[PDB]
Amino acid sequence: ATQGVFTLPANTRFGVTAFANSSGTQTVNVLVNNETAATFSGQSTNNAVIGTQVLNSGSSGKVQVQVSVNGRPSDLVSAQVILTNELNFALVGSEDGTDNDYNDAVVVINWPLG
Amino acid sequence: ATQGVFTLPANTRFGVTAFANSSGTQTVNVLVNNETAATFSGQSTNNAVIGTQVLNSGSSGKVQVQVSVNGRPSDLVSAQVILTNELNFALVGSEDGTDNDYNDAVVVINWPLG
Amino acid sequence: ATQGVFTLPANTRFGVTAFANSSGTQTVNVLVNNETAATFSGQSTNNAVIGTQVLNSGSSGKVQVQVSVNGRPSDLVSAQVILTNELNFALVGSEDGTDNDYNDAVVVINWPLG
Amino acid sequence: ATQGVFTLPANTRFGVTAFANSSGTQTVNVLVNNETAATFSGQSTNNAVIGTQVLNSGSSGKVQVQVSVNGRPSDLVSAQVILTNELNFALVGSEDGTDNDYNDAVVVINWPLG
Numbered sequence: 276a277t278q279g280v281f282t283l284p285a286n287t288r289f290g291v292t293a294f295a296n297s298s299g300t301q302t303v304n305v306l307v308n309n310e311t312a313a314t315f316s317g318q319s320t321n322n323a324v325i326g327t328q329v330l331n332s333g334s335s336g337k338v339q340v341q342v343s344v345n346g347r348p349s350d351l352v353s354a355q356v357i358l359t360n361e362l363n364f365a366l367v368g369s370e371d372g373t374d375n376d377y378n379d380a381v382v383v384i385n386w387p388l389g
Numbered sequence: 390a391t392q393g394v395f396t397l398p399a400n401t402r403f404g405v406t407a408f409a410n411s412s413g414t415q416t417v418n419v420l421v422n423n424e425t426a427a428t429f430s431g432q433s434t435n436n437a438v439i440g441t442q443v444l445n446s447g448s449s450g451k452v453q454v455q456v457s458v459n460g461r462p463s464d465l466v467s468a469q470v471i472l473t474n475e476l477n478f479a480l481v482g483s484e485d486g487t488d489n490d491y492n493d494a495v496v497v498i499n500w501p502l503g
Numbered sequence: 504a505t506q507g508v509f510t511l512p513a514n515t516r517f518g519v520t521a522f523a524n525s526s527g528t529q530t531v532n533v534l535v536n537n538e539t540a541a542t543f544s545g546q547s548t549n550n551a552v553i554g555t556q557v558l559n560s561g562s563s564g565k566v567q568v569q570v571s572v573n574g575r576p577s578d579l580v581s582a583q584v585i586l587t588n589e590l591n592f593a594l595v596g597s598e599d600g601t602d603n604d605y606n607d608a609v610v611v612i613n614w615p616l617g
Numbered sequence: 618a619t620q621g622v623f624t625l626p627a628n629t630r631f632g633v634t635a636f637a638n639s640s641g642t643q644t645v646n647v648l649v650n651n652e653t654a655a656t657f658s659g660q661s662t663n664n665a666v667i668g669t670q671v672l673n674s675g676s677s678g679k680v681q682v683q684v685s686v687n688g689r690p691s692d693l694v695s696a697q698v699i700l701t702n703e704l705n706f707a708l709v710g711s712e713d714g715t716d717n718d719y720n721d722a723v724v725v726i727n728w729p730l731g
């Protein structure tokens with residue numbers, strides 16, 4: 276199944292935050308309406324926050340997370356959870372290797388803000 | 390129901406990251422085995438990361454998040470999600486006022502690391 | 504925080520299914536747009552499926568679950584999860600006693616159907 | 618990533634319940650410690666319950682859901698959600714065709730029971 280794609284409400288601010296847990300340098304690209312809107316890179320085995328930014332979901336509300344290591348796409352896992360019918364989290368994990376820890380880049384999207 | 394309490398595997402590193410979305414300064418306490426292990430304080434209406442840390446779940450695995458604003462406890466909402474039976478997210482929202490956005494402090498716990 | 508309230512897409516068929524795990528007789532009310540649309544009842548400590556129904560979310564999309572036992576309202580916990588940005592589950596647990604298992608009536612809402 | 622595999626607490630009763638939403642007859646196999654423990658088959662386009670059963674997670678706690686239609690494996694999506702650190706849902710959707718609704722068989726695993 277497709278993973279790392281989320282439909283947000285249109286024209287809505289959201290937070291995106293990426294963490295790294297791998298010997299491989301992570302590249303996190305965050306696409307809004309199929310164009311890169313934020314990019315984070317880094318290498319950590321201790322959950323560094325390799326980036327955090329506020330973006331706008333724009334007219335389509337389509338948000339996609341892509342994770343690659345030196346140009347090789349990582350395998351993604353994802354889901355969205357809603358608390359008290361108001362508070363939204365879009366969650367991504369990624370695997371750059373063979374151990375299937377799926378934490379090599381971890382991306383958290385949250386909305387609403389403010 | 391109790392919210393903001395999570396059972397992690399024992400003796401396991403985890404990440405905790407807090408975001409703020411309120412006119413009020415948020416104070417987040419992260420407890421391990423009922424004792425505060427991290428405190429983050431900050432003020433943002435734009436989802437700023439007010440703190441991030443790596444902690445160890447220790448012998449009990451018990452992790453609790455508490456949020457206060459102007460010396461008063463916020464109401465919490467929480468859940469845990471597991472992706473591909475490997476990647477864990479413990480999610481907390483908090484409400485310090487009357488609008489029930491539950492984003493006033495947002496806390497994300499993730500494990501495993503490395 | 505409020506629990507057991509979900510916003511579905513308007514005019515959308517959904518499934519609602521109730522499970523019982525308590526010595527107390529469960530009564531589960533399912534409200535659509537603040538009017539009772541389904542009532543299920545039973546008594547099981549082995550997860551009996553006391554009801555399952557297909558309902559339509561109608562113009563408002565508002566669905567609320569309430570649970571009572573021997574005339575007393577149960578405490579609710581809830582969340583919504585979305586898989587592959589398409590498959591939706593709205594989840595409720597309820598507690599009628601002292602043990603905080605929150606399984607006394609369990610309600611799962613799923614959409615889309617067909 | 619692997620989907621439909623869940624680690625339950627050992628020696629714990631759990632519920633498994635399947636729904637169908639497809640022109641294809643669904644076959645749901647539930648494996649405990651890699652051995653078939655339950656099988657449900659049925660056909661519905663209206664979310665009918667095609668099976669429900671109570672199983673024991675046994676010494677390993679390993680539970681796996683597989684779905685096939687006319688002997689062809691469906692693609693799966695899954696996650697686990699925990700409410701109030703007590704109430705567990707292991708959720709599976711499956712796709713037997715081209716529309717990516719992932720509801721063709723829906724499988725809900727819930728624990729604890731009782």
Ligand SMILES: C[C@@H]1O[C@H](NC(=O)c2cccc(-c3ccccc3)c2)[C@@H](O)[C@H](O)[C@@H]1O
Binds near residue numbers: 299300344371374379
């Ligand atoms: C420390 C481990 O790092 C692994 N990752 C790698 O070993 C890795 C992956 C891709 C590329 C590279 C690499 C390539 C060129 C130079 C340096 C590192 C390493 C990762 O999958 C494991 O879960 C674990 O966190």
Ligand SMILES: C[C@@H]1O[C@H](NC(=O)c2cccc(-c3ccccc3)c2)[C@@H](O)[C@H](O)[C@@H]1O
Binds near residue numbers: 485488
């Ligand atoms: C900007 C708004 O800020 C609210 N914040 C408050 O209601 C709040 C609650 C307690 C104290 C304060 C505060 C503290 C010092 C100075 C000014 C305000 C704000 C918050 O709940 C809303 O969701 C929104 O983000």
Ligand SMILES: C[C@@H]1O[C@H](NC(=O)c2cccc(-c3ccccc3)c2)[C@@H](O)[C@H](O)[C@@H]1O
Binds near residue numbers: 524525526572573604
């Ligand atoms: C078997 C247990 O049942 C409990 N519930 C009760 O014991 C209960 C709740 C409400 C009413 C009654 C009841 C009252 C009068 C006479 C008989 C039963 C029991 C429940 O909370 C526990 O999790 C557990 O499943």
Ligand SMILES: C[C@@H]1O[C@H](NC(=O)c2cccc(-c3ccccc3)c2)[C@@H](O)[C@H](O)[C@@H]1O
Binds near residue numbers: 714718
């Ligand atoms: C009604 C539709 O049914 C589709 N499924 C099929 O049409 C399907 C898939 C596999 C096999 C068969 C089939 C094959 C032989 C005989 C009868 C059914 C149908 C399903 O994917 C769609 O979401 C939708 O619910």
Ligand SMILES: [Ca+2]
Binds near residue numbers: 297372
């Ligand atoms: Ca890895």
Ligand SMILES: [Ca+2]
Binds near residue numbers: 297502
């Ligand atoms: Ca890793």
Ligand SMILES: [Ca+2]
Binds near residue numbers: 486487488491492493
């Ligand atoms: Ca608020």
Ligand SMILES: [Ca+2]
Binds near residue numbers: 410411490493
């Ligand atoms: Ca706020």
Ligand SMILES: [Ca+2]
Binds near residue numbers: 604
């Ligand atoms: Ca109970």
Ligand SMILES: [Ca+2]
Binds near residue numbers: 524525604605607731
């Ligand atoms: Ca019970």
Ligand SMILES: [Ca+2]
Binds near residue numbers: 714719720721
């Ligand atoms: Ca389908």
Ligand SMILES: [Ca+2]
Binds near residue numbers: 616639718720721
């Ligand atoms: Ca279908």
